[PDB]
Amino acid sequence: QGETHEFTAEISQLMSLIINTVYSNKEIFLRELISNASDALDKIRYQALSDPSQLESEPELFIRIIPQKDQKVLEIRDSGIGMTKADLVNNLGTIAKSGTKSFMEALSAGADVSMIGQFGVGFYSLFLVADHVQVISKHNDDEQYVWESNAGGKFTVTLDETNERLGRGTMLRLFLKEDQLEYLEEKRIKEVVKKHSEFVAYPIQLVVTKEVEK
Amino acid sequence: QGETHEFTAEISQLMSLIINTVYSNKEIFLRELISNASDALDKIRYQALSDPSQLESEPELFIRIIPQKDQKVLEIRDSGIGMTKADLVNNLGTIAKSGTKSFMEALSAGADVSMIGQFGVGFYSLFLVADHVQVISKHNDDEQYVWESNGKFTVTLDETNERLGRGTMLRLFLKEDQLEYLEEKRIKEVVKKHSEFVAYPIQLVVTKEVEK
Ligand SMILES: C[C@@H]1C[C@H]2O[C@@H]2/C=C\C=C\C(=O)Cc2c(Cl)c(O)cc(O)c2C(=O)O1
Ligand SMILES: C[C@@H]1C[C@H]2O[C@@H]2/C=C\C=C\C(=O)Cc2c(Cl)c(O)cc(O)c2C(=O)O1
Ligand SMILES: [Mg+2]
């Protein structure tokens, strides 16, 4: 029952730029996704001021990073406001954010890719480190959905009948490129996170899997 | 489409015994579940010698322990052979396995619970530390199912949990006085003490907040 959609041209152009012309500072993808998560948590907190029942779906407010070495996947989960189906379709492909063209012009003018969040399209920096991505999201009073794309021209949005229940919020699953597997290692993730985590108000949890020795 | 079934008498009788018992070595539940996991992995490993395609669904052979503190749940996952819908219905409630009665009679006579695995029903020692349990399982060429009981149980097509690929995951809803088994140090102690001779990696998933 999976809708298929095409990326709007400006977003396809933006991903083209990012994938093909940005050679350094690829680690900023994690700052950008942590920022999106923090914003999403801000939003549910705001709603909770007028209606504290909105937090009941998932009471703890967190940002969680989960390296999955077996699958060569890096997951980033938050318990923020989450997204409906229409939210996923519009925020992540069909509507070009106002800043998309502006950001492409800024890159051409000499901007560092680190600036991408100032233009509201920080999501797309993940394609610096991944060719395939799933976005799982759960909004109050709606079902859980999965958005998926392979850094191409189309994406799908489907009712989620295969992933763990989020309760509320969003989880990105980054299928990392073969030369970008450094981001599955605890020490590298901590290094990158500590650079820009001094003013994040929420706990950033790192899930590490280690074999029991002895 | 969730089939609901009643526990067979001898199994319901057994769980009552275990759940109510006063034991001091309740930590043996983890040895029993790790042993079940190791057995399931042996079986898919052997089958894969004649048909290596059987591992493609989940190429890694592992035992994975995942404390979920927010939910007060301890998960134990393996990539073994898994169970069909019929396997779940029969193995875990409707058919009393040979040795169910024998172990209950031994327990009533005073035997230590540590003996349960020799009767092949070590699964039910999880009720030493949990009141509710879900068993998620995926066998090759069948769908993923969830068995659940908190004196009836249900088996349902799994459309809510992470895909296992292949194998089995127990989700133990721990009693309020048994939450020590969510702590990294306690689990490592129990694993090193009683599961030292397992042929597969036993992985512990630990969540730690980053110092911002
Ligand atoms: C619409 C909601 C709430 C918005 O406040 C967040 C700010 C920017 C979000 C941009 C998005 O594209 C969706 C999104 C992404 Cl990409 C992410 O990594 C994490 C998230 O939690 C959300 C989200 O759930 O977004
Ligand atoms: C039927 C298969 C293969 C069997 O060889 C294992 C030996 C005993 C298993 C007993 C069971 O009740 C099912 C089971 C349990 Cl309880 C468990 O904790 C972990 C598992 O991986 C399996 C399983 O998938 O078992
Ligand atoms: Mg072994």
Give one DSSP letter per residue of B46-67, joined into a string.
Answer: HHHHH-GGGGTTS----EEEEE
Residue B33 CA: nearest ligand 2 atom is 18
- SS3 state of residue A193: helix
What's the N-to-C CA distance of chain B in angstroms?
47
Contacting residues of A for B70, CB less than 8 Å apart: 60
Amino acid A97 reads K
Is A139 within 8 Å of A81 (Cβ atoms)? Answer: yes
3-class secondary-structure state, position A73? strand
Residues whose CB falls within 8 Å of the CB of residue A98, separated by 6 or more in sequence, listed in order: A120
What single-letter DSSP state applies at residue B197?
A: T
The pair of structure tokens assigned to B95 is 């058919």
Sign (positive or negative) of CA dihedral B112, B117, B120, B126: positive
Tokens read off for A113: 């890719």
**Chain B residue at shortest CA distance from A60:** B70
Buried b (16+ CB within 10 A) or exposed e, A100-120: beebbebbeeeeebeebbebe
* A12, A124, A127 from A17: Cα distances, Å: 9, 10, 10
CATH number, span A1-214: 3.30.565.10
Looking only at the bridges linking them, the beta strands covering A204-211 and A63-68 are: parallel
Among B121, B210, B77, CA closest to A195: B210
Q: In the numeric block, which tokens belong to residue A3? A: 């809708």
Specify the DSSP element, H or E, that contains A35: helix A28-50
Amino acid at B7: F
Pocket flag, ligand 1, residue A83 (CB < 6 Å): yes
Cα separation of B163 and A164, whole Å?
A: 8
Q: Are the beta carbons of A102 and A115 closer than 8 angstroms?
A: no
- Cα-flanking dihedrals φ and ψ of residue B198, to 5°? -100, 135
Residues A53, A59, A64, A69: what is their CA dihedral angle, to the nearest 10 degrees? -110
| Dihedral angle computed from the Cα positions of residues A172, A173, A178 and A181, in that order, rounded to the nearest 10 degrees | 70
Dist. CA B201–CA B63, nearest whole Å: 6
Cβ of B38 closer than 6 Å to ligand 2, yes or no, is no
Q: Is B71 helix (H, G, I), strand (E, B) or coil?
A: coil
CA neighbor of A149 nearest in space, from A130, A170, A134:
A134
Q: Does B157 touch chain A if contact means CB atoms closer than 8 Å?
A: no
State which H helix or E strand residue A172 sits in: strand A169-176
Resolution (A): 1.7
CA A43 – CA A46 distance, rounded (Å) = 5
The vertex-A20 CA angle with A110 and A33, nearest 5°, equals: 80
Q: Which alpha helices (DSSP H) does A76-170 contain, by range?
A: 85-89, 99-109
Structure-solving method:
X-ray
B155 contacts B85 by C-beta, under 8 angstroms:
yes
Q: Does domain B1-212 have CATH number 1.10.10.60?
A: no
Are the C-beta atoms of residues A65 and A78 closer than 8 Å to each other?
A: no
Strands (E), A35-121: 63-68, 73-78
Indicate which of B69, B210, B211 best probes the interface with A, i.e. most A CBs within 10 Å of its own CB.
B210
Other CB atoms within 10 A of residue B110 CB? 6
Which amino acid is present at B166?
A: R
Output the CA torsion sign for B93, B98, B103, B104: positive
- DSSP per position, B87-114: HHHIIIIISPPTTHHHHHHHHHTT--GG
Nearest alpha-carbon partner for B86 in B164, B42, B145: B145
Provide CB contacts within 8 A for B39, sequence distance 6+: B80
**Any idea which residue has 């002895």 for tokens?**
A214
B97 is in an annotated binding site: yes
Kindly state if the Cβ of A95 falls inside 6 Å of ligand 1: no
Beta bridge partners of B182: none
Q: What is the CA radius of gyration of chain A?
A: 17
Helix axes B184-194, B28-50, angle to 10 degrees: 70
